């Protein structure tokens, strides 16, 4: 019944307007109440009332421009007020009395302020909850403008003022919204959630008028609050009904400017408590404070006004509101908390002790929330996620993350892998923006961190992240922090401590390449080496005790260069002794050859640079390398072994007869190779056993060419060759 | 040849004079010169003279004022009231066309011309030119109206009717002796509901009253059909009513009109549920004709 | 245009790189990259990884991934290149490492594990030590300078060494051709 209604409404109003062209009003008023007629229904949807409220509201916006026109230039028909109160039915008499009304506003200023209070107690006639709200709307619109104000020319012949507005429009609101709650209550109870879907639909009907009510602007702050402020406060109360205050407490603070939330929080907070118990709070109260952002975040305006701190209100009356909260999942609880750490933030991003109780406060709102240690899978973590990140990432310096008081407090509630990640996350965050020098205020709490951290190639990389993040400039705290870190780090287990205690030993090298540099300062500088370097000894020995062969080596190797490179007293049997210690793990422990060329070369790599020992035991490991030369199982190894060995004879002809008798010991081809070598250990001594140059060389001509030729040969006879190319040197 | 003599009536004053007008039966209206009581009716009766030649035997003429009713569609009961008798011309011979002027002295006139359902009450000139075998006669209505005044006592009707425990309202007239013009104000405060009525209204019956003893005909007769809260209400609501009377244009009260029938007007509250049960109440209101003053 | 480095020691000796260095080491414009090990993580080479596909790395001592090769000989254009990480070379300081390019027939070799930068040529090959780009610190040289060196376009290599000087990259350039 939607269609024809609108059809035979195009029918009369037809013979509306050609009886308007006619000037034949009385006619159109004829034919337009038989259109008008149509408009009775309530057989139709609350959208389909819609389509056709605009219908008429453009027919008769013909018939409500023809009598404007015949007003102005002097063709008045007079005492139109009752003309078009003569018949029975009242959407063709009220919608005519709009239309005469508002003109009967403007034609007669005199009865401005009667008409206006007249005609909505008329539109009390009807108490129909579909047809007097599209009544009521259509009211608005034709009462927009013609309110009266003090924003209005000066003649002297008007009646009523801005509070004759927004009385009556109030009068207008009051009725139309529990006119929506007269929605909720009509029709059968098979259609309450077609209704209540058809009420959203709707809803924007009362919307339109508010909109009205803020375009006045000679209301003040205070005319607003003891009028206008109630005068839609007294709806809130009296609605009585869940989904009437969803769509209009948010509308309020939508539509009416910012300047009139400031002091009116208190009020209103008290309107959100007074709210019902069924309604979807947690959107209203995050939009509740986006302007008060927004009213904080603008330039070349008001702003905030210090004296209403909303840090001293919002936390007492939302908590307040929460309070006449009853039934509610309590994600929504701390939703207001994301509020509620934001916004101190960006109020006061200067006061230490104000964001500083917020979440003392939210530790203290957990400490009576007797809830699970929280993990991952509920919504609940996603938004505590969120909490925390805004220190770590939204702090001005990142180091006040980590001066902050109660943070760690907080920490212990997580599951096992959120509290490592975002401690991940924490400590990428503050290498990410790169700090310096750190003291004890800051050094435990982060080893309390990594506490929630422990107990990866991740943890590989953070922990040498870590001390190069607790690198600082004081010599011996930053010793007790590698003592801490390890003695944490040590709580670990074994398993990750593979990986972060050699950095701990690079901290502590260049902690003792710290420490070299103080000889003008202080006189305690050799006392602590040795000390750290125990120290790195048993860290060493810890990852001795933690089954590791190759890496502890050179640990000892680099900790005895670093034995080596300082020179603090008593470090060479040290240096030596670790030297002897890896090299007795070595004989010991390493059992692949190959790493075992690569632990005794380097060792000779080690040992010759030990240019550190004295003879005195260097020579007992220069026997005890060549006895660790003899204890290499392949030839040619063991061969460049004493050949390198020559170079711990830096002997001379002693060596090179040794090598050449272990290259004798021996694929020929691999074999005269090395007699080039041996040509060329002699060679390099030799540029410093003249003729053994001049009997090897040609010893190598024999022993040359005696071969097939293969992919391989080829390149060694040309470095046979240019080999005597470098002999010229001439 | 037709009619030899006809008889023409022209008022004295019959310029200045209206008095409105209304009605008769098959939707015609009567427009006549506007009487009321304690005037002077003067005139001049003319007769027609159309044939010459022809000598006109009569034996008397006259005019009698009448003020008289119709009832019951029957020649043997009709009334009339009031009559003044003016005679005309004297037995005697006619030749060319006549003039009869007519001036009598106080004309009491006492009630309005009202022609109800039944009830036709009229005022006429009846000039009778008596010749040997009959007589011509002449019917030029006068409308009268009756004029009472703003009284000193227009009381507040008020009752708390309804039905017992389905609906209590607490209607309300403000006035009780309206005029012809005046504007029906009333109240109406619900108390108590348990029936679900959908829309419904105020009727308006003009009660005209015919017959005298117990043969005594009632017709039933609605003017208007108005509206009320329209819903169905629960306490703490009332209903504003405003109505016009001048869309229905209604006559004067006058009880017992002249010893043989009456009019008055009558309010009766009927509210319609979805089952469509009539449930009513009657009071009336007076009516008198308010002059322009 | 081919990226040269090593010893990167991430976590090891250094973390933190130059972002002068990873500004300039922004991806897309070197086609290859020749590090000579002691990355010390895979995240050292996977940061590498962003920067170019074509990248090879030989094993250093300090390499805890024990997959890398020892060595490492290649051919791409006109030359023939070779790598090494260093610590086989004994004693560091030596022509004693054009001894090692006669074993393996190259013109271009790389060297490290002494962590400054150098790059030469002698009897017609070329060697290159590029030092840290990580400017990761040595045992015996305390103070450290962090470089990375980048282009071979026929029988004739461009080789530009990035250089941390001061407080901007001091960008050094020499030219060598294939003879």
């Known amino acids: 019944l939607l269609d024809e209604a609108i059809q035979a409404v195009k029918v009369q109003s037809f013979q509306m307007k050609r009886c308007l062209d006619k000037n034949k009003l009385m006619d159109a008023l004829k034919h337009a109440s038989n259109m008008l007629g149509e408009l009775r229904t309530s057989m139709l949807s609350p959208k389909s009332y819609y389509e056709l409220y605009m219908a008429i509201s453009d027919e008769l916006h013909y018939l409500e421009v023809y009598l404007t026109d015949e007003f102005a230039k002097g063709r008045k028909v007079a005492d139109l007020y009752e003309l078009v109160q003569y018949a029975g039915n009242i959407i063709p008499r009220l919608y005519l009395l709009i239309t005469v009304g508002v003109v009967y506003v403007k034609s007669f200023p005199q009865s401005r302020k009667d008409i206006l209070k007249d005609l909505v107690e008329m539109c009390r006639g009807v108490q129909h909850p579909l047809r007097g709200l599209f009544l009521r709307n259509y009211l608005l619109q034709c009462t927009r403008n013609i309110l009266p104000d003090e924003g209005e020319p000066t003649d002297e012949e008007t009646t009523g003022d801005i509070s004759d507005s927004m009385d009556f429009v109030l009068l207008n609101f009051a009725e139309m919204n529990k006119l929506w709650v007269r929605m909720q209550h009509q029709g059968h109870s098979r259609d309450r959630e077609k209704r209540e879907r058809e009420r959203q639909e709707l809803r924007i009907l009362v919307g339109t008028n508010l909109v009205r009510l803020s375009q006045l602007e000679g209301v003040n702050v205070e005319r607003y609050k003891q009028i206008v402020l109630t005068g839609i406060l007294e709806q809130v109360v009296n609605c009585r009904d869940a989904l009437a205050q969803e769509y209009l407490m948010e509308c309020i603070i939508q539509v009416f400017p910012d300047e009139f939330h400031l002091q009116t929080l208190n009020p209103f907070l008290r309107a959100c408590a007074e709210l019902h118990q069924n309604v979807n709070v947690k959107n209203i109260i995050i939009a509740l404070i986006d302007r008060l952002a927004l009213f904080a975040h603008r330039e070349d305006g008001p702003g905030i006004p210090a004296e209403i701190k909303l840090f001293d209100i919002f936390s007492q009356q939302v908590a307040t509101v929460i309070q006449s909260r009853q039934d509610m999942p309590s994600e929504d609880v701390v939703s207001l908390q994301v509020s509620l750490i934001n916004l101190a933030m960006k109020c006061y991003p200067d006061r230490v002790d104000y964001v500083d109780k917020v979440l003392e406060t939210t530790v203290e709102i957990f400490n009576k929330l007797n809830l699970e240690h929280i993990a991952t899978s509920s919504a609940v973590s996603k938004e505590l996620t969120r909490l925390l990140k805004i220190p770590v990432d939204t702090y001005n310096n990142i180091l006040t993350v980590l001066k902050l008081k109660h943070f760690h407090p907080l920490f212990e509630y997580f599951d096992y892998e959120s509290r490592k990640s975002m401690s991940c996350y924490v400590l990428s965050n503050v290498l990410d923006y790169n700090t310096e020098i750190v003291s004890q205020d800051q050094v435990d709490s982060i080893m309390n961190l990594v506490s929630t951290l422990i107990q990866f190639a991740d943890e590989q990389s953070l922990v040498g992240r870590f001390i190069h993040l607790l690198r600082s400039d004081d010599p011996d705290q930053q010793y007790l922090i590698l003592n801490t870190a390890r003695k944490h780090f040590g709580a670990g287990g074994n398993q990750r401590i593979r990986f972060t205690l050699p950095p701990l030993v690079f901290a502590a090298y260049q902690l003792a390449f710290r420490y070299k540099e103080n000889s003008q300062m202080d006189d305690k500088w050799e006392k602590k080496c040795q000390k750290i370097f125990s120290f790195a000894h048993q860290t060493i020995s810890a990852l001795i005790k933690a089954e590791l062969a190759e890496l502890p080596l050179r640990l000892f190797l680099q900790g005895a260069l670093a034995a080596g490179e300082i020179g603090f007293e008593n470090h060479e049997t040290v240096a030596y002794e670790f030297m002897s210690q890896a090299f007795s793990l070595y004989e010991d422990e390493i059992s692949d050859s190959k790493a075992q060329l690569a632990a005794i070369t380097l060792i000779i790599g080690t040992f010759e640079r030990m240019k550190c020992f004295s003879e005195e035991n260097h020579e007992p490991l220069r026997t005890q390398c060549a006895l660790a030369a003899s204890k290499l199982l392949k030839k040619p190894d063991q061969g460049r072994a004493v050949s390198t060995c020559a170079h711990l004879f830096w002997r001379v002809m002693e060596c090179l007869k040794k090598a050449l008798k272990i290259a004798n010991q021996c694929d020929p081809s691999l074999q005269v190779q090395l007699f080039i070598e041996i040509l060329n250990r002699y060679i390099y001594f030799y540029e410093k056993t003249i003729q053994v140059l001049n009997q090897l060389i040609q010893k190598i001509r024999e022993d040359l060419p005696n071969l097939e030729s293969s992919e391989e040969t080829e390149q060694i006879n040309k470095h046979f060759h240019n080999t005597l190319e470098h002999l010229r040197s001439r | ?293 | 245009l081919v990226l040269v480095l090593g010893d990167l020691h991430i976590p090891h000796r250094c973390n933190s790189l130059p972002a002068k260095f990873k500004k300039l080491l922004v991806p897309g414009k070197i086609q290859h990259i020749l590090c000579t090990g002691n990355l010390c993580t895979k995240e050292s080479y996977d940061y590498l990884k962003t920067l170019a596909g074509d990248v090879h790395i030989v094993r250093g001592d300090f390499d805890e991934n024990l997959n890398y090769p020892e060595q490492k000989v290649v051919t791409v254009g006109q030359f023939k290149i070779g790598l090494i990480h260093g610590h086989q070379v004994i004693p560091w300081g030596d022509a004693s490492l054009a001894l090692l390019q006669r074993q393996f027939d190259v013109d271009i070799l790389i060297s490290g594990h002494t962590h400054k930068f150098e790059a030469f040529e002698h009897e017609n090959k070329f060697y290159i030590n590029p030092g840290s780009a990580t400017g990761a610190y040595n045992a015996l040289e305390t103070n450290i300078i962090p470089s990375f060196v980048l282009d071979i376009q026929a029988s004739t290599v461009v080789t530009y060494v990035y250089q941390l000087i001061g407080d901007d990259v001091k960008v050094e350039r020499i030219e060598y051709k294939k003879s």
């Not at chain 2, 310029?15 to 003067?42: I, P, Q």
């Not at chain 2, 005209?208 to 819903?231: C, L, Q, V």
Request: glycine share 6%.
């Open chain 2, 1 to 293: 040849f037709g009619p030899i003599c006809e008889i023409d009536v022209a008022l004295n004053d019959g310029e200045t004079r209206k008095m409105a007008e209304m009605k008769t039966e098959d939707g015609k209206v009567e427009k006549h010169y506007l009487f009321y009581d304690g005037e002077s009716v003067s005139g001049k009766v003319n007769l027609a003279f159309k044939q010459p030649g022809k000598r006109l035997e009569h034996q008397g003429i006259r005019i009698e004022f009448v003020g008289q009713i119709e009832l019951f569609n029957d020649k043997s009961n009709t009334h009339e009231f009031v009559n003044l008798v003016k005679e005309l011309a004297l037995p005697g011979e006619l030749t060319q066309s006549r003039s009869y002027d007519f001036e009598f002295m106080q004309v009491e006139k006492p009630y309005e011309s009202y022609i109800g359902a039944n009830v036709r009450l009229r005022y006429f000139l009846k000039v009778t030119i008596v010749r040997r075998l009959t007589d011509l006669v002449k019917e030029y209505d006068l409308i009268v109206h009756q004029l009472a005044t703003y009284p000193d006592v227009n009381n507040s009707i008020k009752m708390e009717v309804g039905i017992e425990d389905c609906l209590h309202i607490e209607f309300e007239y403000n006035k009780s002796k309206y005029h012809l013009k005046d504007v029906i104000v009333g109240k109406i405060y619900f108390l108590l509901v348990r029936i679900k009525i959908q829309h419904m209204e105020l009727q308006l019956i003009k009660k005209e009253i015919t017959g005298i003893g117990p043969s005594t005909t009632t017709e039933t007769e609605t003017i208007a059909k108005y509206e009320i809260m329209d819903g169905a209400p629960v306490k703490g609501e009332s209903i504003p009513i405003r109505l016009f009377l001048a869309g229905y244009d209604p006559t004067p009260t006058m009880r017992d009109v002249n010893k043989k029938f009456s009019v008055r007007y009558f309010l009766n509250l009927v509210l319609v549920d979805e089952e469509d049960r009539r449930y009513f109440k009657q009071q009336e209101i007076i009516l008198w004709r308010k002059a322009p003053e």
